[PDB]
């Protein structure tokens, strides 16, 4: 069961089927923080296994 | 209040911070008694302690002695408290005494109710045992120190940390691609980071040789003033008791 | 004795790679040859290019001789090349005897419209034979970290009243209060300044200190320089003083203060432990 | 022959080294097994096994399953058998699972005698557990790994090691003082030194955070060539066995 | 004798900041100048100083046209103010026309007697026209690091016979058996050498090495710097030649050695770990 | 000269003397 501040799980029950919900991906890193993290991940195994 | 400092994993500079924090809260002007839980007894050396002198609280109880009485003070404002020199049989063999040094718990919580001390800082090791997971349940807050590398950004999320700790980084080298990376990740994925970090000096490994804090052995070096910034930090944000 | 007065002595620098513009353009690798070589002239304009901070008392060194001993026909510029100058170094060149400083932000093109402005023009402004007056005016305090309360207000007011200085941006003047959780003289160990003009005092549970020539617009990025912390978390209240007036009627009432309520800081600014029983 | 590698202090390199050593070994053409008797469990990631893979030689035996079942092989040459990541209770309460695993040092005396490989390295804590002074006492061989620092100085004179064992340097910088002043009396005071020591090299760093060995991720690194030495110097010095 | 018989024409650094000697010393700020002044000269002494292995080649010119110009009655040496330079270097520069070289280690007076010792000299030796064969008299076979047994063989064999370099001395061959622990393919990954020149190889379970322009002495050394570990730990019997004649003999019986028993160097996206079962 | 360094480094760091003055 996911975060209840972040998202929710709805169950159909007449099928067997759960959507389930969250808040839109919103990132606020700034225009080279994010941009050197990706190439940070891209370029070791070790840090992109915990992303 | 009572703060315990206790690394991630060996070696990453757990002993010589944690005497370098306490030379600054009593250059603050403020009652500091600093002890040392570790059973290499490495923080004693920190203080022109002759290394001979084997006198130690976990010493004085499996002695059956009075602990209080193996205290030293360095300066006015400065207590320590050393863990004694254990013999090679006593150091190969933990399981002997690990279960015999249950009574610093209550002599600790004497020690803070009495109001001598504004900080007591303790000295944690990496082990799990019994003693070290009852004097980190008795601190008030506690500080996390890592390295940089990609073994403590292993250990930082197979190892769980102390609730409502600090991360401290050490030992920070400018110039490294992948230190460079590994932080990065973690300015924007670990929110317990603190605002300040200690750089990789000279002075911190030439003071543990001259047997002095580092605050004593060089005021202006940049490792220092930073540690000093710590204790500052202390004052405005870790100075509450927190029960 | 044809006049000079076309003729254009400049630092290669100046011309950003492009080749000598005309017949009258003498290009030299360095201030030094071209400052020896100006000396002969009369009617010349002269263009010396400022790259480091380095350079600054030897330019002003270079351009007060030929100021002096070369008169008022001679028209002397300087070429920025660099941004990180501070503002109190334009005007110390330009009392040395230089025409006119080129800012960095301005493109070659801009740059050979101002030296084609100089033509012609006399030099009017007063220039002293002694450079030590004009030098010493770079560093009017001569002082920099803590003083003592009696004298942060003397060595501060003595460059208030300063005559030589001119009034706007002769600085900034900040009283903090600190945060309960921390004392005066604790927080007054994070205050650690740089510059060789700031000095700092301690009295009446507030930490006041003086920046020299800091505008009131760069106040917050100059205490993020003296301050590892931010400045919101160790003080609670902070009151400024830039204009001279004010500053100086807060100088006036900051000596309305006893000695006995002035600071000073913690006396720590081989040991040998002994035992003793903890507890007692 | 069994080879121990140990750290006389924690965080001084050995998990490195000993993936390092291992890729070294095998490239010289022996059959080597690494098994990794940490319980951090870090060695399994020099050779690119994700994180999330609990299984372990440790992990089996306290599951009740067969700890054989548990090896991953890297090359031709070199196996590899991981510790097992252990849960949260297990790392807080090291006492209640420290001794229900004697069964793995009377497996390895089955694969000492198997002869399948030349080489198993044993990847040593820095603790006095039993099964650290049980598995220690299989080793034909020891090294102890320090870092050229007051921490270890101190440790190699209060501190005791299996006898017989060598000292192996690593993290050697350039340019410190302090260093140059304990390396030089080292030299003249230390008889168990190595022949051969290993540099800080940012290989070393960036091997880990790529998953590989030093010797696979930068083969002409000098840290890679200094242990490709100690490699031959194994084979030279360390090939008799114990009795 | 000639009129500046007793001239001495001298680097400044020969004198080592003594002042000037006598009326007949005249000293220069580097050597460039000082050649220039000793194109003029009949019988003067001229003492160069050599600080830097780059200034080997142009030095070498320098004697070379001087001497080839100006005649035997002229003397030259050249005063060593570096211990960087190879003992191959005061080959060159003898063969160029230098009278003597005055080593590095020799104090100022050890320096001065032998510039006083050439007095009186006429050079009698034969020294070309061409600079080219000169530097070409000490270029080492151009190869280094591991080799296969017949280029090996081939390398050392066209270079016992190149007629441009001088009679003795080419190097030494040296031919060592490794100890019962470790084999010849492993004891190979310990031989890593520097200089260009030294070039090596496997075959019949001996590593077999050739250091170009070594000599019997520096044998030790040389091997120090090629190993980390010392020889004697690495290789139970060690065999040397050193004169051509011992180095051309051994390498036509390494001829003799089938190509079966030649050695090679061991062999040695991300590797996976395979899962599988002990025993 | 390398009996001289050794003189001055235990001079210079308390640590090491304690430990080779015993
Ligand atoms: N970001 C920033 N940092 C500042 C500022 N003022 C001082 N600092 C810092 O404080 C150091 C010492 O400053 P100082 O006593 O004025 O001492 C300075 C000053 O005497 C002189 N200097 C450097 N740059 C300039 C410049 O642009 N103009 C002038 N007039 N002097 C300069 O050289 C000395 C050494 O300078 P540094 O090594 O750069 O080191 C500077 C720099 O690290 C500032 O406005 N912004
Ligand atoms: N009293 C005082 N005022 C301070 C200090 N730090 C900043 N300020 C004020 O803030 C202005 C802008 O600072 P900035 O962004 O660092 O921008 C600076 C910086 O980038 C550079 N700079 C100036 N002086 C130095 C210096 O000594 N060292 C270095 N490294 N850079 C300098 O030139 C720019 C313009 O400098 P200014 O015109 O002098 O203008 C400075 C000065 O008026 C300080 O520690 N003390
Ligand atoms: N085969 C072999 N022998 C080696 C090597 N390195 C050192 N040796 C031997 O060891 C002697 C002393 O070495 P050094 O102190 O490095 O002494 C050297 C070194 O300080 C410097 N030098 C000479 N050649 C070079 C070069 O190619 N590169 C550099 N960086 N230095 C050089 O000048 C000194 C003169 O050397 P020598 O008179 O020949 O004397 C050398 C030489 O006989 C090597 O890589 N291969
Ligand atoms: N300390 C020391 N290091 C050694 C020695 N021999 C080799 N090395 C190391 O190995 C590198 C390659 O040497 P090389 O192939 O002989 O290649 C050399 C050689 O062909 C020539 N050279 C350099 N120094 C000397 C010298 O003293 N005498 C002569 N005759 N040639 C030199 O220039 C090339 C480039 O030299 P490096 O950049 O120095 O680079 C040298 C140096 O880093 C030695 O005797 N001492
Ligand atoms: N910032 C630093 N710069 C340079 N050297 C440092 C720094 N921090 C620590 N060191 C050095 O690292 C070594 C180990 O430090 P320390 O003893 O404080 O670590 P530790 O975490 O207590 O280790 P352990 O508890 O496993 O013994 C010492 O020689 C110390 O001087
Ligand atoms: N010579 C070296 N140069 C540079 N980095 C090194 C060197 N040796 C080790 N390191 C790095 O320092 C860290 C040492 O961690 P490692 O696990 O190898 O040591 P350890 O002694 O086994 O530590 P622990 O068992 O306490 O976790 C790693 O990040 C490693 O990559
Ligand atoms: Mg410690
Ligand atoms: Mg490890």
Same mark, same amino acid.
């Given at each position: 069961?996911?975060?209840?501040?972040?998202?929710?799980?709805?169950?159909?029950?007449?099928?067997?089927?759960?959507?389930?919900?969250?808040?839109?991906?919103?990132?606020?890193?700034?225009?080279?923080?994010?941009?050197?993290?990706?190439?940070?991940?891209?370029?070791?195994?070790?840090?992109?296994?915990?992303? | 209040?009572?703060?315990?400092?206790?690394?991630?994993?060996?070696?990453?500079?757990?002993?010589?911070?944690?005497?370098?924090?306490?030379?600054?809260?009593?250059?603050?002007?403020?009652?500091?008694?600093?002890?040392?839980?570790?059973?290499?007894?490495?923080?004693?050396?920190?203080?022109?302690?002759?290394?001979?002198?084997?006198?130690?609280?976990?010493?004085?109880?499996?002695?059956?002695?009075?602990?209080?009485?193996?205290?030293?003070?360095?300066?006015?404002?400065?207590?320590?408290?050393?863990?004694?020199?254990?013999?090679?049989?006593?150091?190969?063999?933990?399981?002997?005494?690990?279960?015999?040094?249950?009574?610093?718990?209550?002599?600790?919580?004497?020690?803070?109710?009495?109001?001598?001390?504004?900080?007591?800082?303790?000295?944690?090791?990496?082990?799990?045992?019994?003693?070290?997971?009852?004097?980190?349940?008795?601190?008030?807050?506690?500080?996390?120190?890592?390295?940089?590398?990609?073994?403590?950004?292993?250990?930082?999320?197979?190892?769980?940390?102390?609730?409502?700790?600090?991360?401290?980084?050490?030992?920070? #080298?400018?110039?490294?691609?992948?230190?460079?990376?590994?932080?990065?990740?973690?300015?924007?994925?670990?929110?317990?980071?603190?605002?300040?970090?200690?750089? #990789?000096?000279?002075?911190?490994?030439?003071?543990?040789?001259?047997?002095?804090?580092?605050?004593?052995?060089?005021?202006?070096?940049?490792?220092?003033?930073?540690?000093?910034?710590?204790?500052?930090?202390?004052?405005?944000?870790?100075?509450?008791?927190?029960? | 004795?044809?006049?000079?007065?076309?003729?254009?002595?400049?630092?290669?620098?100046?011309?950003?790679?492009?080749?000598?513009?005309?017949?009258?353009?003498?290009?030299?690798?360095?201030?030094?040859?071209?400052?020896?070589?100006?000396?002969? %002239?009369?009617?010349?304009?002269?263009?010396?290019?400022?790259?480091?901070?380095?350079?600054?008392? =030897?330019?002003?060194?270079?351009?007060?001789?030929?100021?002096?001993?070369?008169?008022? %026909?001679?028209?002397?510029?300087?070429? !920025?090349?660099?941004?990180?100058?501070?503002?109190? /170094? !334009?005007?110390?060149?330009?009392?040395?005897?230089?025409?006119? &400083?080129?800012?960095?932000?301005? =493109?070659?093109?801009?740059?050979?419209?101002?030296? !084609?402005?100089?033509?012609?023009?006399?030099?009017?402004?007063?220039?002293? !034979? /002694?450079?030590?007056?004009?030098?010493?005016?770079?560093?009017?305090?001569?002082?920099?970290?803590?003083?003592?309360?009696?004298?942060?207000?003397?060595?501060?007011?003595?460059?208030?009243?300063? $005559?030589?200085? $001119?009034?706007?941006?002769?600085?900034?003047?900040?009283?903090?209060?600190?945060? =309960?959780?921390?004392? &005066?003289?604790?927080?007054?160990?994070?205050?650690?300044?740089?510059?060789?003009?700031?000095?700092?005092?301690?009295?009446?549970?507030?930490?006041?200190?003086?920046?020299?020539?800091?505008?009131?617009?760069?106040? /917050?990025?100059?205490?993020?320089?003296?301050?590892?912390? $931010?400045?919101?978390?160790?003080?609670?209240?902070?009151?400024?003083?830039?204009? /001279?007036?004010?500053?100086?009627?807060?100088?006036?009432?900051?000596?309305?203060?006893?000695?006995?309520?002035?600071?000073?800081?913690?006396?720590?600014?081989?040991?040998?432990?002994?035992?003793?029983?903890?507890?007692?």
């Amino acid at each position: 069961l996911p975060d209840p501040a972040i998202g929710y799980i709805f169950q159909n029950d007449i099928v067997a089927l759960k959507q389930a919900f969250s808040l839109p991906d919103i990132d606020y890193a700034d225009i080279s923080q994010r941009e050197q993290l990706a190439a940070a991940l891209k370029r070791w195994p070790l840090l992109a296994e915990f992303a | 209040a009572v703060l315990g400092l206790q690394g991630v994993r060996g070696g990453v500079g757990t002993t010589t911070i944690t005497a370098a924090l306490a030379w600054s809260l009593q250059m603050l002007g403020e009652n500091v008694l600093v002890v040392d839980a570790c059973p290499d007894n490495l923080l004693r050396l920190s203080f022109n302690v002759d290394f001979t002198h084997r006198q130690g609280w976990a010493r004085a109880m499996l002695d059956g002695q009075d602990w209080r009485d193996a205290g030293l003070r360095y300066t006015s404002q400065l207590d320590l408290l050393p863990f004694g020199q254990l013999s090679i049989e006593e150091q190969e063999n933990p399981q002997h005494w690990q279960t015999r040094l249950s009574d610093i718990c209550s002599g600790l919580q004497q020690l803070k109710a009495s109001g001598r001390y504004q900080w007591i800082l303790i000295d944690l090791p990496r082990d799990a045992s019994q003693i070290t997971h009852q004097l980190l349940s008795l601190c008030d807050h506690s500080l996390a120190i890592v390295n940089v590398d990609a073994n403590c950004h292993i250990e930082l999320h197979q190892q769980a940390l102390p609730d409502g700790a600090h991360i401290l980084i050490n030992n920070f #080298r400018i110039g490294s691609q992948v230190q460079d990376d590994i932080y990065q990740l973690w300015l924007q994925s670990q929110r317990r980071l603190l605002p300040m970090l200690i750089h #990789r000096d000279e002075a911190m490994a030439e003071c543990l040789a001259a047997k002095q804090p580092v605050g004593e052995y060089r005021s202006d070096a940049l490792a220092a003033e930073e540690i000093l910034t710590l204790a500052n930090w202390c004052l405005l944000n870790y100075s509450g008791l927190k029960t | 004795p044809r006049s000079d007065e076309k003729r254009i002595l400049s630092n290669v620098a100046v011309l950003e790679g492009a080749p000598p513009l005309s017949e009258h353009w003498q290009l030299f690798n360095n201030n030094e040859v071209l400052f020896n070589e100006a000396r002969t %002239a009369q009617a010349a304009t002269v263009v010396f290019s400022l790259q480091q901070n380095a350079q600054i008392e =030897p330019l002003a060194r270079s351009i007060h001789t030929l100021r002096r001993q070369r008169g008022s %026909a001679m028209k002397i510029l300087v070429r !920025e090349n660099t941004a990180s100058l501070r503002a109190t /170094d !334009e005007r110390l060149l330009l009392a040395c005897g230089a025409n006119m &400083v080129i800012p960095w932000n301005a =493109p070659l093109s801009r740059c050979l419209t101002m030296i !084609e402005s100089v033509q012609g023009q006399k030099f009017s402004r007063y220039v002293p !034979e /002694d450079i030590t007056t004009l030098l010493s005016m770079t560093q009017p305090l001569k002082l920099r970290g803590f003083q003592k309360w009696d004298v942060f207000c003397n060595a501060v007011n003595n460059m208030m009243n300063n $005559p030589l200085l $001119p009034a706007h941006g002769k600085g900034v003047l900040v009283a903090l209060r600190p945060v =309960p959780g921390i004392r &005066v003289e604790q927080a007054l160990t994070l205050c650690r300044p740089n510059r060789t003009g700031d000095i700092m005092t301690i009295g009446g549970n507030r930490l006041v200190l003086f920046l020299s020539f800091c505008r009131i617009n760069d106040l /917050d990025t100059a205490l993020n320089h003296i301050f590892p912390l $931010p400045t919101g978390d160790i003080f609670s209240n902070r009151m400024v003083w830039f204009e /001279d007036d004010q500053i100086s009627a807060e100088l006036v009432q900051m000596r309305l203060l006893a000695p006995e309520q002035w600071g000073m800081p913690l006396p720590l600014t081989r040991r040998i432990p002994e035992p003793m029983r903890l507890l007692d």
